[PDB]
């Protein structure tokens, strides 16, 4: 991308018929860390005491 | 034909190439993607999950017991509980954790780290603990008076069983080297010290266990990242697997 | 044209790391961010700004080198069959378990959906394994389960009317081809807590999920080889979905088709003589 | 010339390539396409056509007779007529049918299958038959009491000569493996059992033939498909044909 | 540009398999979907939903791997002429009947209209058939019926003023070329219930349709060969129309130009000892 | 096609003059299974009795 | 450089290639095109021009005389004048004509052909002639009764010297094979027979020449075409010309 | 990578290629173009400039004197002054002129040529001269009676010192061959004859020089051109220059 | 595949190529660019900075003293202080300066140069100096009378310690050659002479230092440029550095 | 140019950065033959006598 900073901007051009032929995907996809870090029924806000 | 000039790098195979390539089964139609819980898009979602430090790495301790730092009733004031060189590389206790094992695959790191400690003594067992982070330049702090001069939290044992010492990203540069490669002087990237001290003492009712434990846990903060993939040192083989 | 627009996907890596807000001192009984409870199973919520006095930091670091695509998106060795001169035929069973680096990288997840780019480097050598000159075509035939296997260099199975084949030269550029996600399942499985068969609980069929196994690559030279050929088979994983992260492999791998380990000395990190000094 | 970088896979010949290539007769003008009846665009149009199972595969039965399952007057109740492992691969009776011979060219299959049975006894010959499909996990059902617990139809011999047992796609996964490759444990894909039982008995007027036949027929339902072409096992040659 | 739009055809494989509608129990004398009559010659009309209680299933599976194009649309071996060093000349009669895999795939249909991509791999070897080095141009000449055939390596027929030729190197990339549907008929015929000639009923001209035969490929090296050359001729069938499906070949093929079979043991599937056990 | 599910979407680009040069066709064409499965003068609806 | 993948057929030379190629004299400016009479754009303009059949191919006839079929005063009724197998290939009389020599360069043909006959007897010489075309399936017609059952014209000698028998394209297929290649059974493409008969007789005044001639001529109709270029059989050389 | 098929002519070097090629100094910025008088864009600007014929090529004449054709007082009528075969090739007098030396670099020529003659006698010297151009087909004209039948000018010596005989492009074809290559019969391109005759006589006052000179000059007309570069015959070397 | 014709220069590696090439780490995200003082975009920003001439290059002078030209009290009139051949190449005093060391990397130069001189005598020390630039064609000026005929400045020692002699670009051509390559006669590019003379004398109070110094400094003007990179002569090695 | 007569019509496409990389120029440039054929202060029209 002739460079913004940490932004790689790519035009993936597949020359073949099957999508599997395309090169690797460069998108950043959504991160939901809280399904692993906060996997609890009741949210615990940072400023609260956790138990009770 | 269109006139061309193939240049240098013709016919090479680079393992990190990003090129399209002909599909050997161009008519295949894969099975649909179904919903599965826990989809991961980025390995820093794993690095932000707490894992247990193999913190009791004393010679002779084997198995599950390497995960519990001893904490005892002291007969002297201001004693030291624990000492740990802040390092994502090498082979010390951080190296076998989730964050440490991810760091084995990377060359460089940046960001804040947090250490969560859980006390395991009886309900009736009390104590106060000082957890210190010393930025680099010197040695491990020798006494609690010297360690307190750094970043530190003071932990009171109670109903809330656990504490966090956030080790903040304090650094001359935007990134550090994961490894401690000697020939390359990567000790340049020394990242400081973590020490644990008795702030008062562990106190027990008569005839209770005079020894309890801390389970140390570590994870990355949301400001953390890794660069440069590299081979994992301790995942080797001498033969093809059969 | 719009039709050519269909063959182009603009895709962007511009996700940043979290920044830092300045904070000041707090003297209160209201807000206690440092008090935690690891028993819940939740990771600590305390942040930098609530534990010390911070400055403001504008985020500048990317996260893309740890995206699952980037982490898997390079080629690794997965098969090294040797074609001898006695029969001029060899094969490789297709799975990523002979060589430990890719297998250990995959062990961070349970289910993985991907495509594959395969790359084959052929190298000719003498009996004493010194590089030598040999120009010859070779044939790699995909033989799926239930297709008859070639038994010789001249077997009429190499017709390849229905098995796909790639023909390339030993001293030419490397053969390369892509493969879609081929499992009968909706993902591959890195680990399997079950049996390969009903009405059977043989230990040799524990942990064997046959929907990971898509068959064989078979290799001949198109004439009888004068020198032995070594094929190196590289796989790059691409267009990758990953689910359910795991504790990664820590003990060395010992067998291709199960997780057996030594476990003689229960430790991973190195020892020291005292917990209060280095 | 335009600068280029030929990469890996240069000059290879892949048999499934989808590439244009120069025509050795670029001025040729073919004969027109005329109308012909029965144009086929997809081989699953053939797979949906019923064909006869080589169902009477008992050792010693040769020729056309392998196509008629015996059905007799029974002297005991609830007897078994037929048993068949549901398999598109291997070498059992389904393997030589239209659907089975197409499955020989493919590695994987999905969808519902139907089996149509035609009774061939005299007009005066009566009977009722139970046709059962047992999902996998165990063995072939041992008695009609066990077989009836599955999917099943009950057939009354009469003016409408034929019956359909639809074997529905009942499966943990979206696709199964066609083959039963042992080294690869493709028995993982075991697809269940088809059995036939006397629901009442075959009954005849005095002096009629005490034996008649069922002609079994099989075809794919419209929800059926195949993946991964593969070589047919039993279409071989030891020499070039002259 | 629109002119370049003429050279691009957007073509789509998105036909799905049939789905499933939920159904409930039926107790009636009105609707009897399970009662059939195979005597009519019609296949059963009964469906899943009318025989058992079904759930709803959204269709997700494609059908494209069994489209006639995909089924034939790969390369298969059809000719393997050997060029010896004594005369340095060979030929291959052009038809898809020497090698059984493509022939058996074609036996599913009566009439077939297609184009062909031919691919030729040349391999040099010694008298003991071990791969060897030989760099030489070779010439493949299409010789149609009635054109004089070359009799030697230096015959002036190889001028090729009107026969098309391809020149390629033995140790270069494979020669490849396409061919339109060339029959004088409006399709090719996989099977022919007639005679090649009027006023003749010789058994050797039964089943011979000469409109399938477009002639010969002739092969020389441009100099006299030092080692024998084996040409492997691959054909990929493309742009395919198919009519009138058949019972596919079941007995092994025995002869190139007729359907003769052994038929000693009349069975196809394997035997068992009892119809009521496996 | 950088992917919908089971939809392969291809731009066949022929570089040569003759249509026979083009790569293989990826269209799915119409299926009329009933010319082979229901090849009878009188339609028999599924819920009816076939004979009479 | 633009990443590329050279595929199979790289560096081959096909004699029917249609590719642009660098000009060794890119600044040359040719002489203008002037008007010349008789520009030909398509060789079927030549094939529609009549030429003389080498029809009197009897052993012993040499030179110009091979172009005149004898016609005599008959002493018997319904006699045969000529017989000719309808063939564009082979080596019979049609093979040396303009249409036949063009057919030597092609493998396949379609369309109607016409044969124009010119009588060369004296002004006073009379006669009527039957020209027959018999579609294939059998032999040459043996007598005028059998030949008349086919397509035929009846020619009266008179002021208009010439007649046309149009041999129409009557054919199971859209195209036939030019050659009669035996190993390939191209006799499959047998195209029928042309025969000439006395419809009445040739009659002369006393003492006139009792023998005259027909000059046969042949050409293609506008519905005619050729396919597949092929080498001409009889244009050979044993040495390079010096 | 984009699939490609390198064809014939790959990796060849043709000396007349018109292709772009990578610059070994891509950042260089040349000195500006300044005005210089006499810029030439096309070598036919040089060919239209008159130059002196090496016309007095008689054996024994050396140096500057080869540029002056003798003209004398005649003692007989209608005598010949000069004869010259019209040829841009070969080695006769036209070959060393500006037009002739350019023609050495080319294979073919077209257009009109002019010859300008300058008389160098004394002011008092008179004469009339016939300059003839004879189109090809025969020999050089033998006498002034035969030469006058062609294109010709008649020159009167006087104040205007010079005359032009325009040799017009008179030719069966649009172009002629420069060379007279014998093996290739390029004498086919014979372009005619130029001859000079005394129309009256050279006349002098008593005791004046009885011999004077013509300086012949030649150039191309604006309708002239050259094709096909070719190597110059007489610019050779036996060794590399040191 | 797209038909192509790779041409000459295929697979060559030119060190000045300007081509894109595949990145071995295509997912890497570098550290941000921070502000640093003194960013340089063009090495002619360095060439316009004054540096000290190694001007006192007399045999026997070592070290820092080579940077001070002696200036003394004279006992004779119009004496010479300094002489210097104007040359960016070679090995004389200009060659080791900032401008001279940049010129070592380049083949050609153009533009004006300035020389700034700083007097270092005591406050009480007076003098007047003539600084001359002589365009090429002859030798170094022999006396102050000859040198004054050129471009020159006259310097009065005083409060403003320094003077500039601007050596203007005076040149037949737009560029000169940096080097004095003998085999190639690059003395063609001789650029003239710089000389320094006593305009009056250096005068001192009694008992002061009778010798003082000039520090000469040189830099390029804004109209200056360099062409053609070339290897630096005096930056060599006989072995790989370890 | 797929052919007008003596008109070569070319699109010179340079793939490299420096103009010197481009192929050779195919333009016909202006011809002023008279700076060499008529290099004289006073024009002499064809129909006039040159001297005087
Ligand atoms: C042969 C057709 C040429 C089309 C290729 C144009 C160049 C590829 C696009 C690359 C897009 C991302 C590059 C970047 O900005 O970093
Ligand atoms: C040669 C063309 C078809 C070959 C299919 C290869 C697909 C390989 C996927 C392997 C996924 C399972 C990995 C494992 O079991 O460890
Ligand atoms: C070499 C260029 C012209 C060759 C023409 C080849 C066309 C082959 C079509 C064969 C179709 C009939 C197949 C068969 O008879 O079994
Ligand atoms: C040299 C001209 C470049 C034109 C080729 C552009 C890429 C080919 C189009 C491929 C279209 C189908 C790809 C896909 O979406 O799966
Ligand atoms: C790779 C980009 C393709 C662009 C090249 C298109 C063809 C070159 C243009 C040639 C123009 C002059 C040809 C002519 O008309 O004679």
**Counting atoms of ligand 1 from 1, which one is nearest the CA of A8?**
16
DSSP G77-139: TT-EEEEEE--SSTTSGGGGSHHHHHHTTEEEEES-EEEEEEE-S-TT-B-EEEEEEE-SSS-
Q: Whose CA is nearest to atom 9 of ligand 3?
A: E95
Residue C129, min C-alpha distance to chain F (Å) = 43
Tokens 């990339």: give the residue. E173
Reference G179, options G169, G171, G170, G189; nearest CA is G189
Residue E113 contacts residue D48 (beta carbons within 8 Å):
no
CB atoms within 10 A of CB G27: 12
Show which subunits contact H, needing at least 3 CB pairs below 8 angstroms. A, B, D, G, I, J
Q: Is A12 in the pocket of ligand 4 (CB under 6 A)?
A: no
Cα torsion angle, I141, I145, I150, I151, sign:
positive
Give the SS3 label for residue C125.
strand
Q: Please state the φ and ψ torsions of residue G51, each to the nearest 5 degrees.
A: -135, 165
Cα I40 from Cα B213, distance rounded (Å) = 59
> How many independent structural domains does chain I possess?
1
For D140, the token pair is: 């072939």
Residues 6+ apart with CB under 8 A from H30: none
Cα H45 from Cα H39, distance rounded (Å) = 10
For A40, the token pair is: 């609890």
Residue D154 contacts residue D88 (beta carbons within 8 Å):
no
Cα G2 from Cα I4, distance rounded (Å) = 13
Residues on chain I touching G9 (C-beta within 8 angstroms): 1
Residue D42 contacts residue E256 (beta carbons within 8 Å):
no
Enumerate residues 1 to 52 of chain A having a beta carbon within 8 A of any beta carbon in chain I. 5-6, 8, 26
Residue C39 contacts residue C81 (beta carbons within 8 Å):
no
Residue G124 contacts residue G204 (beta carbons within 8 Å):
yes
CB atoms within 10 A of CB E193: 8
Q: Whose CA is nearest to atom 3 of ligand 5?
A: B2
Residue G67 contacts residue G53 (beta carbons within 8 Å):
yes
| Residue contact I4–H9, C-beta within 8 A | no
Cα G16 from Cα E205, distance rounded (Å) = 34
Q: Is C96 in the pocket of ligand 2 (CB under 6 A)?
A: yes
Query: Is there contact between B and H if contact means ≥3 C-beta pairs under 8 Å?
Result: yes
Cα E107 from Cα D101, distance rounded (Å) = 12
| Residue contact H7–I9, C-beta within 8 A | no
| Residue contact J26–G27, C-beta within 8 A | yes
Alpha helices (H) along chain B: 44-47, 98-104, 144-147
- Nearest chain F alpha carbon to I2: F15
* CA A43-A44-A49 angle, 5° bins: 155
Q: Please state the φ and ψ torsions of residue B113, each to the nearest 5 degrees.
A: -125, 150
Show which subunits contact A, needing at least 3 CB pairs below 8 angstroms. B, C, F, H, I
Residue H179 contacts residue H74 (beta carbons within 8 Å):
no
For J50, the token pair is: 């040159």
For C226, the token pair is: 């004068």
Show which subunits contact E, needing at least 3 CB pairs below 8 angstroms. B, C, D, F, G
| H160 at I interface, C-beta within 8 A | no
* CA I225-I226-I227 angle, 5° bins: 130
The size of the H-I interface in CB pairs under 8 A is 56
Residue I57 contacts residue I92 (beta carbons within 8 Å):
yes
Cα torsion angle, B178, B184, B186, B187, sign:
positive
CB atoms within 10 A of CB I190: 17
CA of A11 to the centre of ligand 1 (A): 6
Residues on chain C touching A31 (C-beta within 8 angstroms): 15, 63
Give the SS3 label for residue H30.
coil
Length in residues, chain A: 52
Displacement of CA I224 from its chain's centroid (Å)? 12
Resolution in A: 2.2
The size of the D-E interface in CB pairs under 8 A is 272
Cα I18 from Cα H93, distance rounded (Å) = 54
Show which subunits contact G, needing at least 3 CB pairs below 8 angstroms. B, D, E, H, I, J
Residue G54 contacts residue G66 (beta carbons within 8 Å):
yes
For E236, the token pair is: 């990929």
What is the span of the domain harbouring residue H238? 1-242
Q: E-assigned strands of B73-192?
A: 80-85, 106-110, 113-119, 128-134, 151-156, 162-167, 176-177
Reference B119, options C44, C36, A46; nearest CA is C36
* CA G90-G95-G99 angle, 5° bins: 130
Cα C111 from Cα B31, distance rounded (Å) = 14
Q: E-assigned strands of chain H?
A: 2-6, 51-52, 69-72, 80-85, 106-110, 113-119, 128-134, 151-156, 162-167, 176-177, 193-198, 211-220, 225-229
Q: Is A15 in the pocket of ligand 4 (CB under 6 A)?
A: yes
Residues on chain G touching E214 (C-beta within 8 angstroms): 228
For E251, the token pair is: 């007995």
Q: Which residues have any ligand 3 atom within 6 Å of their CB? A: D 24; E 94-97, 116, 142, 179, 182, 188, 212, 214, 217
**Going by DSSP bridges, is the β-strand pair C137-143/C82-83 parallel, antiparallel, or unpaired?**
unpaired
Residue D199, min C-alpha distance to chain G (Å) = 59
- Nearest chain B alpha carbon to D110: B31
For J1, the token pair is: 């140019």
- E89: β partners: E220
Q: Which residues have any ligand 1 atom within 6 Å of their CB? A: A 1, 9-11, 13; G 2; H 2
- Nearest chain D alpha carbon to F32: D45
CB atoms within 10 A of CB C5: 10
Q: Whose CA is nearest to atom 8 of ligand 4?
A: A15
Residue A19 contacts residue C181 (beta carbons within 8 Å):
no
For D53, the token pair is: 């199972």
Nearest Cβ partner for B27 among E60, E61, E64: E64
**Going by DSSP bridges, is the β-strand pair I69-72/B51-52 parallel, antiparallel, or unpaired?**
unpaired
CB atoms within 10 A of CB C266: 12
CA of E59 to the centre of ligand 4 (A): 29
Tell me which of G12, G17, G94, G232 to substitute to probe the interface with E (most E C-beta atoms closer than 10 Å).
G12
| B237 at F interface, C-beta within 8 A | no
Residue G44 contacts residue G190 (beta carbons within 8 Å):
no
- Nearest chain G alpha carbon to I7: G22
| Residue contact D4–G7, C-beta within 8 A | no
The size of the B-E interface in CB pairs under 8 A is 14
Residue D20 contacts residue D32 (beta carbons within 8 Å):
no
Q: Whose CA is nearest to atom 14 of ligand 1?
A: A1
Tokens 């196809």: give the residue. E268
For G109, the token pair is: 């043909």
Reference I171, options I112, I89, I99, I219; nearest CA is I112
Q: Is C91 in the pocket of ligand 2 (CB under 6 A)?
A: no
CA of A43 to the centre of ligand 3 (A): 73
**Going by DSSP bridges, is the β-strand pair H128-134/B193-198 parallel, antiparallel, or unpaired?**
unpaired
CB atoms within 10 A of CB I214: 26
Nearest Cβ partner for G11 among H8, H173, H175: H8
Reference H167, options H235, H232, H218; nearest CA is H218
Give the SS3 label for residue J10.
coil
Reference B86, options B168, B1, B174, B3; nearest CA is B168
Q: How was this structure determined?
A: cryo-EM
């Amino acid at each position: 991308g002739a460079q913004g900073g940490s932004t790689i901007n790519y035009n993936n051009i597949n020359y073949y018929s099957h999508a599997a032929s395309a090169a690797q995907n460069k998108q950043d996809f959504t991160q939901d860390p809280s399904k692993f870090t906060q996997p609890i029924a009741d949210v615990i806000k940072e400023t609260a005491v956790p138990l009770k | 034909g269109l006139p061309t000039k193939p240049g240098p790098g013709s016919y090479q195979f680079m393992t990190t190439d990003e090129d399209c390539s002909p599909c050997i089964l161009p008519d295949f139609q894969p099975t649909p993607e179904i919903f599965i819980p826990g989809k991961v898009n980025n390995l820093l979602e794993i690095a932000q999950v707490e894992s247990i430090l193999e913190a009791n790495n004393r010679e002779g301790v084997e198995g599950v017991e390497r995960y519990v730092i001893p904490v005892s009733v002291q007969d002297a004031l201001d004693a030291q509980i624990y000492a740990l060189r802040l390092e994502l590389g090498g082979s010390g206790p951080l190296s076998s954790s989730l964050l440490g094992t991810l760091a084995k695959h990377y060359t460089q790191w940046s960001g804040s780290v947090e250490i969560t400690c859980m006390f395991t003594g009886t309900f009736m067992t009390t104590g106060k603990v000082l957890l210190a982070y010393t930025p680099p330049g010197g040695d491990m702090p020798r006494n609690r008076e010297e360690a307190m001069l750094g970043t530190h939290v003071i932990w009171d044992f109670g109903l809330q069983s656990s504490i966090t010492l956030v080790i903040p990203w304090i650094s001359a540069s935007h990134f550090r080297g994961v490894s401690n490669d000697d020939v390359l002087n990567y000790q340049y990237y020394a990242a400081g010290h973590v020490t644990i001290w008795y702030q008062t003492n562990m106190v027990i009712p008569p005839g209770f266990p005079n020894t309890a434990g801390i389970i140390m846990m570590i994870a990355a903060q949301p400001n953390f990242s890794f660069r440069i993939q590299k081979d994992r040192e301790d995942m080797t083989q001498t033969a093809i697997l059969q | 044209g719009k039709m050519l627009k269909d063959a182009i996907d603009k895709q962007v890596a511009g996700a940043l790391v979290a920044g830092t807000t300045t904070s000041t001192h707090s003297v209160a009984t209201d807000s206690t961010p440092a008090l935690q409870a690891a028993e819940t199973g939740a990771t600590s919520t305390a942040r930098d700004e609530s534990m010390i006095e911070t400055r403001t930091i504008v985020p500048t670091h990317g996260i893309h080198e740890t995206s699952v695509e980037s982490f898997f998106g390079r080629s690794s060795l997965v098969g090294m069959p040797l074609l001898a001169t006695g029969t001029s035929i060899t094969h490789w069973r297709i799975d990523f378990r002979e060589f430990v680096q890719l297998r250990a990288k995959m062990s961070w997840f349970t289910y993985m959906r991907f495509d594959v780019e395969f790359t084959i480097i052929a190298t000719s050598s003498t009996g004493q394994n010194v590089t030598t000159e040999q120009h010859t075509t070779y044939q790699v035939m995909y033989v799926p389960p239930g297709a008859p296997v070639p038994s010789n260099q001249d077997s009429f199975q190499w017709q390849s009317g229905c098995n796909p084949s790639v023909f390339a030269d030993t001293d030419g550029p490397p053969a390369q081809f892509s493969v879609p996600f081929m499992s009968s399942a909706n993902a591959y499985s890195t680990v399997y807590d079950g049996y390969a068969r009903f009405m059977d609980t043989d230990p040799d069929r524990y942990g064997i999920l046959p929907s990971n196994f898509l068959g064989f690559m078979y290799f001949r030279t198109l004439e009888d080889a004068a020198h032995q050929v070594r094929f190196r088979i590289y796989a790059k994983i691409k267009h990758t979905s990953c689910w359910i992260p795991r504790a990664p492999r820590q003990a060395p791998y010992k067998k291709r088709y199960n997780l057996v380990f030594s476990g003689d000395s229960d430790r991973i990190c190195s020892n020291r003589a005292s917990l209060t000094s280095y």
